Amino acid sequence: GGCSPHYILNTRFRKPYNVESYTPQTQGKYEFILKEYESYSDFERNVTEK
Amino acid sequence: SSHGCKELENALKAASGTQNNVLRGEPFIRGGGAGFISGLSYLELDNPA
């Protein structure tokens, strides 16, 4: 049996006997992490004997 | 007659530099159409709003 009116947007659904609820609890979580690292090190010498 | 010269030079350079650049963001939405949720929650880094 069943045949209670269940809608999502304009689309109407027939729920299974087994299912208590199927309901559009919409949600969204985005997550962005960017980590850039640089190191440089320079070493020189110049040395002369005459 | 006799002559002597000695010449010496020493030169040193040392350089260093670093960057740390961290960016984080967590847009969060409840309700509305799942496509609008995903499209809007997606972080446009040029326009975080």
Ligand SMILES: *[C@@H]1O[C@H](CO)[C@@H](O[C@@H]2O[C@H](CO)[C@@H](O)[C@H](O)[C@H]2NC(C)=O)[C@H](O)[C@H]1NC(C)=O
């Ligand atoms: C060691 O000597 C070289 C040669 O003079 C140096 O490099 C020169 O540096 C001058 C001034 O900055 C520049 O005009 C030349 O074009 C460079 N030539 C070359 C081939 O690099 C270098 O800087 C010196 N290093 C140290 C640690 O004294």
